[PDB]
Each structure stands twice: as structure tokens, then as C-alpha cells.
């Protein structure tokens, strides 16, 4: 149920997208959910992967048209809260006061769910900026809000 | 710390945690020679299930209700199983096979402690081990058997009452030297004095109640084809503590000896050990006072069965086994009486016997002239009171004919011997037995629930006493769990602890019931088998359902079967075939006179007459008392089992394991605590394990969980808030565990989704940028190209060299 | 369109490729100033740039079609900048292969020949390839 503007601003990404690989009103399927995120969506590789997601670049083309519903499709799903995370990361701080270890950050982030690229993880904390104090831990709930606040704070 | 005394005993943790597991896909199947497998779920065409087989790696067809939950790895040799989350048939014969593969026997099941028999020594048993366990709680240290008794100890202290220790089992699992470490721990730990002497010391009750052992076990034990010393008799043997906890004195009581024995010996088997040590000229000196010439393969009542023993040696132990007379007391009056009346058996062994003239003759005197000289009796008197017996009424005269002597002989050996027995226990309990009562603490060790191919009178005795002693545990476990649920303000009302047992042990030993029966039909000349059978399916056959008829014998090497029991550990088929004879046991009511009236103190007192006695009547009166007593005690429970046909160390045989573990009592003890509630975390370890389970649900203890429950829609008829403890029913943890990880990954997913979503609108903000630059680039770029190739320009810009 | 200093340029071009000097632009021009360096365009292309410009193109309908010819241009400031999008270290170059896929497969898509003509002359050197240059180049400041 997208409003004339929501879908509005759907075309803008779709356009922006459609431009970085090929203006030809299509967009490479393997950029779906980039695409989705784009907008405020927060998917999940078998999310995206199930409503027409493909695995490489070049495998399928997408018109927005047909591009739409496979977005619509996402905005009824699953976007996890505080709760939610706080538990998950909760469940490794052993002693309970919220700290964890920075392998196990690393690690849970990369060996946990399918994957997260050890250089995608560099690349947020080091973007959010979440750094281990002179021990070797880090306050997880503390950086939990920040992959939540999103790039741009208030 | 790292103290290796418990090398064959603990299990490094850390060590150990250094797999996968997918609980919607590893599972168990059955397995025709293996008992289980594990597996690998594939699909599913309803109720049929197909699976991989980690071994092999392949194919199968099992029944989707035929697979076992398999439990993760975080429960790999599990000190306590009854702590698994899926504790199961097979989730049981995975921690004890692989538990007893790394080198540990001792495994916990709640108030079980199951022993499985090490084919060889271990370390455990030193006293340094022994000072490690002193006092300490059963979970604060390894399931180890020294626990078992430790605590037994620490609460007749500390409960002010009788602790019994029952340990059941197969043959060869290991009891009869079980029983011993307990009882060679005990005293370790309620000795005499240890403190405040030189000419102290002058004998030690702790030497005599160990030296006794070899007595008996010379009298009790034999080499069968489990030939371990068979304890072919069930010993009951308590301990007597003083005011202050300490060994004062003790006793013996036994059960069910296989008289059967002491006259024919099958298959590579012997007799009583001391038979063997007498016709070993061990000790000469003696060979006369009883006759013998040492060589056993001589002598017919043993040269039946083999002779030999690997690790016995006959003529050492009897050296020892007279020292042990010695160390004992046993005057040589009395010592030399038993031997006397030993021996003489074997000489009725040899005595044999000479169509029309019906009554039989002797042909020759020569042994029944050394029974009667070994017995103080005349040997005329003996042939002639044999062949030609005179029992009463104006009595009769009654004949035998040449097999009904040769029957006779051996009834005088198999119910000499059998007295001879009884007398040693009552001697040796005598001596033990010093004059001083606290409290106590017993040990069994009789057979255990076993069924075989052909299963007769013995195993029915034998089946009906653990029968007895079962339905002892169930309500030993009923007071116990009330208690807990009272405890925990959560109370429920369930009733029957004990139950069908009731029907099926009644059907035995109540009025009507069977040996109440055949204890009547003992008292009845021309009676035969068929005479037995008609009146025992009569009364019962059809009237009742734990009395049925023979089932399905798909096990082509299986014995025949008249009716067939409800016992817990399987419906038992009988086979009354014999039972009037293997029940009266017969003898002269005229000969037994002579022996009563012989010249030797002993012979004398074995036979003398009650003045002024069925195999099944005395069991069941002998069986009230242990029952009647265990019941004023605080139980404790040995479960052994033999893991192979080969006394190989490390060779487990599931097949056998789980025969044990059914009749064992670790089964028929887990379904009965499956009907109330089995695993139960507390308020706090729960809520910190779950709370990811309804994590909007969060605004303590007992407080979330409350919530986490209802959260998750939790069925009433499925769990019960206790007031520490939260109760759950058997296998929901299993699900609120799957449950707990799908979930786990899926916010986990969650998050790093959203971490993505989290750089991407970052480096939104730049393809918006770049987008444009590039946009340039490619256009002026065209435009420099159109440019550099017009004519208008390539004519305008070739008079600027001219501007 | 190019202010003064074309102003007084255009002037003795236009003025230095009409060989009959009337002020008024005829074909006459593209036949004669034409092999000053190469082949004169021949008979069709010189109808081809002289029918382009409907009316009197005589440095007035002229003025107008260089107009809208170049009018779409951008700055040697604005591309210089453009190419540095792409540049956040400032090495003030862009790689080669980078550039090259970056015209070659996203936006307004260059085919072989668009691309071959491109770096036929790109400013590369050692794998960096200077946008920087080849800047001043496509504008006209650089060695073309
Ligand atoms: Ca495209
Ligand atoms: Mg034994
Ligand atoms: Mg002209």
C-alpha cells in the first residue's frame, strides 16, 4: 500500500541504480536489495533473496515495473529491535555487566546468520567508530544504537 | 587443578569443548547390529522418514516414529544424565558407550549409579582417591561408586537412619566386586583407631569381615560360562555403625544358592570352587582326613563339566581359604567337620548301584563304607536305609528301583551341601556378629531382571524378587518426587508409584497366585506337569491380564513356553516343566534320621530334626524380611552391566547394554518420571537462557519467566511454576531449544542486515554525487569527440594560428 | 557563446577561409582555403556545413550555430572536478582500468569505438592515468 509519493521515491533509487550499471531502465537483480535499503528497508540476503534476488552480477535485469512489487515484498518483513539485538548480544556477555570480546564482536559478526564480510565489518566499526576500551572489550549496547542510528545522526 | 587421581574418572572441559549440530536434521535410528546410528534428516512422505548415516554415509527407511531425539554435543559424557536435554533409550546408550570408551565406568542417572564392568584394574580405587571423595556432595565431584557409599554414610550420620545399598545386575556385571569396594571402603572411613598403640592391636573385625569373603565365595562362587566367581547365591550383608560412627559389627543373609549345582555341572563349567581346592593336595595332612586323592578329574560329581580356571588357582586357595578358616575362629573340630562333610560328597558321587527284580542292589561298598565313616554313620545302615527306605504314616516300607537310588545320592549331596551352607553363613554371621545397635547400612547383591531363551522356576524366583525389589525403587522415587513438588508449592496428585507390579507380584506370592499354588501342588503323589499346568491356567489363564499365552518367537533360537508374565521388563514366557520336582526337594525321611544321629558335632547338627520347607515358601518368607527391611531404609541404587561376551575392555555390544538398561531399572525409572515433570531450571538460570525468546515481553526471575512462558503462548498441561525451580515436561526443553536458535540466528540476521542497510545509505550520498560527475565525464567527452571531428570547428579553429 | 577574445578572432577566420572576401559566407571558401593544409571536403560535405545553417549564414546565422554547438559544454574547472569524484586520496589520478570499466559499463555506456577513440591518446602513465590532463586536453589548453 505505497503512497503515490513513497513509490515516488521508490523511482528515484531505481533511477540512481538503473544509471550505475547501464541507464537502460533496468537493474541488475544482484542490486534488489541494495536498492531496498536505499530507502529505509532492512532485508535479509534470503529476504531479497526470495522475491527475485539472484546470487551474481549478470545473471537477470530488472524493470521497475517488475522491480516494484519485488520491494513491496520486503516491507513486510522482519526488521529486528532493541530487544531483540540486545538479547542476541546478551547471550555472549558471560558476566552480564555488557561487554564482549572483540574476537567474538568479529567473530559472531562474521561466522553468525550466513555471513558479513570481515572487510564490511571493518568497515563499520570503524565507520560507527565502536572501539574495544584499553582491555580488549567493547559495550555491544552501546554500539547496537549506532548500526541503528544510521550514518546520519540527529 | 590438575590432581591425575581422577584420570579414569573426570573429563577435561575445556579440553573437551575444543561440533555443528543441526537438531532439526541429527537424530538416532534403530540399528540391527549396533542398537542405534546416528543420522541425518532428508525428507519426509509422512510417518516415513529417509536419513543419512554419518558412518557409512548413505541411505534408509525408518519409521518417523521410530527416530530418537539426539541430544547437541554440549552433553558429551555427561556425569549426570539425568540432566540431558533428550534423555531417551538411545540418548542414554550414547553417554554411557561413550563415556565407558574414554575409560570411565561411572555414570549417574539421578538416584541410579550405573557401574559398567572395566575388564581390567584402575587407579580409582586407591586411598588417596578415597580422601578426594571424603564427605563431598555427588554433584561436587565424579559419578564415581565411592560417592555412593560416602553419602549413604554421611546421611545414616546426618539422617539418623538405615541406609540400604541394593546393586542389581546381569550376571558378570560386576556387583560381587562392588560390593567389596563398598564394603573395603567402608571400613576405611569407620575404622577402630587411628589416633592415640604398640601391644594395642592383639582377629580385627575389619580382617574377619573381609576374610569371610573367601569362605563363602568358596561355598558360593563357581566357574560358569560368564564364569567371573559366580556368586551363585544372592547375598544380603548390612553393617552396624556405633554412637559415634563407627564400625561395630555385621552379618550375612543369603539368597536363592544353586543346589542344582553341587551334582551336575554342564558345559565347560565346575562346582564350587572348593571342591576343586580339596582334590588339590594344597594340604596333605588332609587328604586322609577326608579320603581324597587329588585329582578332580576322578571325582563324578565335579569331572562333569571342565575343572581348570585360568586365574584360579585351586591349590592356593586353599591355603588361603583355611587361613581364612583360621583367621575366622573355626576350631579344628569344626574347620575339619566341614571338610569331613565336604568330601564326603564326592564319594556319594561315586557310588554306583546293581531287569526283573525291580529293587536295586550296591555293587560294592568301598565309598558308601567312606560316607558313612566321613559321616559317622553305619555304612550298612546307610546302603540299606537307601535302597530300602522306611518312611512314616503305621509307616511303610517303600522300594526304589536303580534310578530312583541314583536320584537319592544326589538329593543327600544337593541337601547336605545346601545345609552345610546355610550352617556356614549362620557360623560366620556368629562370628562377625560381636555383642554390642545404632543404625545400619545393608547391601544387596542378588541376580537381576533377566529373561533368557528358555526361562524356568530359577528365573522366575529370581524375576519375582527384583519384581519385589523394583517396585521398591518406584516407591522410594513416588515419596521423593511429592516431596519436591510439595516443596516448590506445586504440588500435584498423582498416586499409583508402584504399579501393575502389584498385579503381577500378587499373581505370584498372594493366596490364589501361582507358586501359592505350586507350593500346594508339591503335596500331591501322581501329580505330573500336566497335572500342574490345567489348575495353574485354570484358576488364572483367562481370568487375568498380566497371565497371558506365548507370543510372537521370531528369535528361531528361542525355548519353548507354557504361559507368559506382564513383568516391567518384558512379558516373561515360563515353562513349568519340572517345577513339582525342582520345588519339594525329596530325600529319605528315613536317612536324614542317621545323619541327624550321627557321631560327628557338625553332620549331627545339620540333620536334626524339628522336633517336637518348599524352595518357593522359604524365598518368600525370606523375601518379606529384606523387603520389610529395606523398607526401613534409605535405598541407594548400583546398576551394573557387562558390555561384552569377551571381558575386552572398551567392547560395548548395545544389543546387551540395552537388554541391561530395560531390566536395569534406568527405563522403567525415566517413564516413570515421564508422567510428571523431569527437567526443571530455576527462575534465574531460565530466564537468562530464554529471554531472547520474548524479548518485547521484558520490562525478576520467576518474574520473566512468568512471562517469557506466556509469551510464547506456553501450554498449561505442559509446564508448572515452582517457587524456586521451574518445571517443565519431558522434551518441551528440547523444543524451547530449537526454538531458542532459529530464533537466535534469525536476530542475529537481523542485526547484520541492518548493518548493511547501515553503510549503504552511507555511501548513498556519494552515488547521488558521483552519479552527476560521471555524468559529466562521458558527455564532455562525447562533446570533444563530435568537436574534434566536425568541420564548422576544424575550420574555426584552424584561423585561431592566424588570430 | 565565446565572448571577446573569439570576438575578435572569428572576425579574420571566417575572414580567412572566404576567398571571394564579402563579409557574406558562400562554398566558394571550403574550396579554396581548404587545401591550405589537406583535402578540401568534397562537394557533398561542404553542402553538408553550409545547409545545416537555415538563412543568410554569414557570421550572423553563423554566430548561432556554434552557439548551440558548444553551448553544452562545461567548465575545464567543472571537469577537472568531475573526474576527482572519483578521487579521495587526491593522487590527483585516476587508475586506468578503473576509468576505462567506469565509461565503459555504467551511465551513458561508450562502446569499442567511442572508448577506443577516447584513449587513443589518455594521459596514462605506469597504470595512474591522469584525468588531470587529459582535462586541459578535450578542452583545448592541453596538447590535444
Ligand atoms: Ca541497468
Ligand atoms: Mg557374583
Ligand atoms: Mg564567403
Known amino acids: 500500500k505505497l503512497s503515490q509519493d513513497e513509490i515516488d521515491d521508490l523511482k528515484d533509487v531505481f533511477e540512481l541504480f538503473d544509471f550505475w550499471d547501464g541507464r537502460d531502465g533496468a537493474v541488475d537483480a544482484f542490486k534488489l536489495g541494495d536498492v531496498c535499503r536505499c530507502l529505509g528497508i532492512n532485508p535479509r540476503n534470503e529476504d531479497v533473496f526470495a522475491v527475485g534476488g539472484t546470487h551474481k552480477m549478470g545473471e537477470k535485469s530488472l524493470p521497475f515495473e517488475e522491480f516494484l512489487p519485488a520491494y513491496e515484498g520486503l516491507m513486510d518483513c522482519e526488521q529486528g529491535t532493541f530487544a531483540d539485538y540486545m538479547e542476541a548480544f546478551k547471550t555472549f556477555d558471560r558476566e552480564g555487566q555488557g561487554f564482549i570480546s572483540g574476537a567474538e564482536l568479529r567473530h559472531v559478526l562474521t561466522a553468525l546468520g550466513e555471513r558479513l564480510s570481515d572487510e564490511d565489518v571493518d568497515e563499520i566499526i570503524k565507520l560507527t567508530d565502536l572501539q574495544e576500551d584499553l582491555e580488549g572489550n567493547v559495550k555491544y549496547e552501546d554500539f547496537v544504537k549506532k548500526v541503528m542510528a544510521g550514518p546520519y545522526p540527529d | ?803 | 557563446k565565446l565572448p571577446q577574445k573569439q570576438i575578435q578572432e572569428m572576425k579574420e577566420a571566417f575572414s580567412m577561409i572566404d576567398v571571394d572576401r564579402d563579409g557574406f559566407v558562400s562554398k566558394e571558401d571550403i574550396k579554396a582555403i581548404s587545401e591550405q593544409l589537406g583535402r578540401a571536403p568534397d562537394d557533398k560535405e561542404l553542402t553538408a556545413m553550409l545547409k545545416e545553417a537555415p538563412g543568410p549564414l554569414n557570421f550572423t546565422m553563423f554566430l548561432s550555430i556554434f552557439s548551440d554547438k558548444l553551448s553544452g559544454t562545461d567548465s575545464e574547472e567543472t571537469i577537472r572536478n568531475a573526474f576527482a569524484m572519483f578521487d579521495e586520496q587526491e593522487t590527483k589520478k585516476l587508475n586506468i582500468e578503473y576509468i576505462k570499466d567506469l565509461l565503459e559499463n555504467m551511465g551513458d555506456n561508450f562502446n569499442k569505438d567511442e572508448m577506443r577513440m577516447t584513449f587513443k591518446e589518455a594521459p596514462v602513465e605506469g597504470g595512474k592515468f591522469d584525468y588531470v590532463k587529459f582535462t586541459a586536453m578535450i578542452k583545448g589548453s592541453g596538447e590535444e
Open chain 2, 1 to 803: 587443578f590438575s590432581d591425575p587421581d581422577f584420570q579414569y574418572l573426570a573429563v577435561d572441559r575445556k579440553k573437551l569443548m575444543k561440533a555443528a549440530f543441526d537438531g532439526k536434521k541429527n537424530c538416532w535410528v534403530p540399528d540391527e547390529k549396533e542398537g542405534f546410528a546416528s543420522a541425518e534428516i532428508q525428507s519426509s512422505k509422512g510417518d516415513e522418514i529417509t536419513v543419512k548415516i554419518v558412518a557409512d554415509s548413505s541411505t534408509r527407511t525408518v519409521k518417523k516414529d521410530d527416530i530418537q531425539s539426539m541430544n547437541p554435543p554440549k552433553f558429551e559424557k555427561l556425569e549426570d544424565m539425568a540432566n540431558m536435554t533428550y534423555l531417551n533409550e538411545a540418548s542414554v546408550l550414547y553417554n554411557l558407550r561413550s563415556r565407558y570408551t574414554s575409560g570411565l565406568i561411572y555414570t549417574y542417572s539421578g538416584l541410579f549409579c550405573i557401574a559398567v564392568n572395566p575388564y581390567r584394574r584402575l587407579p580409582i580405587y586407591t586411598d588417596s582417591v578415597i580422601a578426594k571423595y571424603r564427605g563431598k556432595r555427588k554433584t561436587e565431584i565424579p559419578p564415581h561408586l565411592f560417592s555412593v557409599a560416602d553419602n549413604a554414610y554421611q546421611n545414616m550420620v546426618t539422617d539418623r537412619e538405615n541406609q540400604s545399598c541394593l546393586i542389581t545386575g546381569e550376571s558378570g556385571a560386576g556387583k560381587t566386586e562392588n560390593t567389596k569396594k563398598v564394603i573395603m571402603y567402608l571400613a576405611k572411613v569407620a575404622c577402630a583407631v587411628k589416633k592415640k598403640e604398640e601391644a594395642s592391636d592383639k582377629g580385627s573385625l575389619e580382617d574377619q569381615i573381609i576374610q569371610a569373603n573367601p569362605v563363602l565365595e568358596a561355598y558360593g562362587n563357581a566357574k560358569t560360562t560368564r564364569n567371573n566367581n559366580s556368586s551363585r547365591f544372592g547375598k544380603f550383608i548390612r553393617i552396624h555403625f556405633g554412637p559415634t560412627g563407627k564400625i561395630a559389627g555385621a552379618d550375612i543373609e543369603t539368597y536363592l544358592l544353586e543346589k542344582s549345582r553341587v551334582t551336575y555341572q554342564q558345559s565347560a563349567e565346575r562346582n564350587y570352587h572348593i571342591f576343586y581346592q580339596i582334590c588339590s593336595n594344597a594340604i596333605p595332612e588332609l587328604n586322609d582326613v577326608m579320603l581324597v586323592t587329588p585329582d578332580s578329574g576322578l571325582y563324578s560329581f565335579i569331572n562333569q563339566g571342565c575343572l581348570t580356571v585360568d586365574n584360579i588357582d585351586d591349590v592356593e586357595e586353599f591355603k588361603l581359604c583355611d587361613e581364612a578358616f583360621d583367621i575366622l575362629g573355626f576350631t579344628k573340630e569344626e574347620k575339619q567337620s566341614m571338610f569331613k562333610c565336604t568330601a564326603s560328597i564326592l564319594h556319594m558321587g561315586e557310588m554306583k548301584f546293581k531287569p526283573r527284580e525291580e529293587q536295586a542292589e550296591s555293587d560294592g561298598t568301598a565309598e558308601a563304607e567312606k560316607v558313612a565313616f566321613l559321616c559317622g554313620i553305619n555304612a550298612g545302615d546307610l546302603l540299606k536305609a537307601l535302597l530300602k527306605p522306611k518312611v512314616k504314616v503305621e509307616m511303610v516300607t517303600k522300594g526304589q528301583n536303580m534310578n530312583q537310588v541314583v536320584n537319592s545320592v544326589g538329593a543327600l549331596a544337593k541337601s547336605l551341601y545346601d545345609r552345610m551352607f546355610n550352617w556356614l553363613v549362620r557360623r560366620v554371621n556368629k562370628t562377625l556378629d560381636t555383642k554390642a545397635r545404632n543404625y545400619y547400612i545393608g547391601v544387596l547383591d542378588i541376580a537381576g531382571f533377566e529373561i533368557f531363551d528358555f526361562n524356568s522356576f530359577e528365573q522366575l524366583c529370581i524375576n519375582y524378587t527384583n519384581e519385589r525389589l523394583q517396585q521398591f525403587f518406584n516407591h522410594h522415587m513416588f515419596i521423593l518426587e511429592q516431596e519436591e513438588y510439595k516443596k516448590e508449592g506445586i504440588a500435584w496428585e498423582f498416586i499409583d508409584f508402584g504399579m501393575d507390579l502389584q498385579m503381577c507380584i500378587d499373581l505370584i506370592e498372594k493366596p490364589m497366585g501361582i507358586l501359592s499354588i505350586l507350593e500346594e501342588e508339591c503335596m500331591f503323589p501322581k501329580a505330573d506337569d500336566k497335572s500342574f499346568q490345567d489348575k495353574l491356567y485354570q484358576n488364572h489363564m483367562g481370568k487375568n491380564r498380566m497371565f497371558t499365552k506365548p507370543g510372537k518367537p521370531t528369535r528361531p533360537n528361542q525355548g519353548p513356553a507354557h504361559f507368559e508374565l506382564h513383568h516391567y521388563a518384558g512379558n516373561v514366557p515360563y515353562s513349568i516343566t519340572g517345577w513339582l520336582e525342582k520345588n519339594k526337594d525329596p530325600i529319605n525321611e528315613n536317612v536324614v534320621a542317621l545323619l541327624g544321629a550321627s557321631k560327628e558335632p557338625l553332620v549331627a547338627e545339620l540333620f536334626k530334626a524339628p522336633e517336637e520347607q518348599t524352595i518357593s515358601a522359604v524365598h518368600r518368607e525370606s523375601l518379606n524380611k529384606l523387603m520389610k527391611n529395606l523398607y526401613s531404609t534409605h535405598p541407594h541404587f548400583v546398576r551394573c552391566i557387562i558390555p561384552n561376551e569377551l571381558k575386552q575392555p572398551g567392547l560395548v555390544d548395545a544389543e546387551l547394554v540395552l537388554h541391561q538398561l530395560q531390566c536395569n531399572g534406568v527405563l522403567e525409572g525415566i517413564r516413570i518420571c515421564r508422567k510428571g515433570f523431569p527437567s526443571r531450571l530455576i527462575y534465574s538460570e531460565f530466564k537468562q537462557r530464554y529471554s531472547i525468546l520474548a524479548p518485547n515481553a521484558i520490562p525478576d526471575g520467576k518474574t520473566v519467566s512468568e512471562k517469557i512462558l506466556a509469551g510464547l503462548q506456553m501450554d498449561p498441561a505442559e509446564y508448572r511454576l515452582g517457587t524456586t525451580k521451574v518445571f517443565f515436561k519431558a522434551g518441551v526443553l528440547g523444543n524451547l531449544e530449537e526454538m531458542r536458535d532459529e530464533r537466535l540466528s534469525k536476530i542475529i540476521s537481523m542485526f547484520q542486515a541492518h548493518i548493511r542497510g547501515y553503510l549503504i545509505r552511507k555511501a548513498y550520498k556519494k552515488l547521488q554525487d558521483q552519479r552527476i560527475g560521471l555524468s559529466v565525464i562521458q558527455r564532455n567527452i562525447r562533446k570533444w569527440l563530435v568537436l574534434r571531428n566536425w568541420q564548422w570547428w576544424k575550420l574555426y579553429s584552424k584561423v585561431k594560428p592566424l588570430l
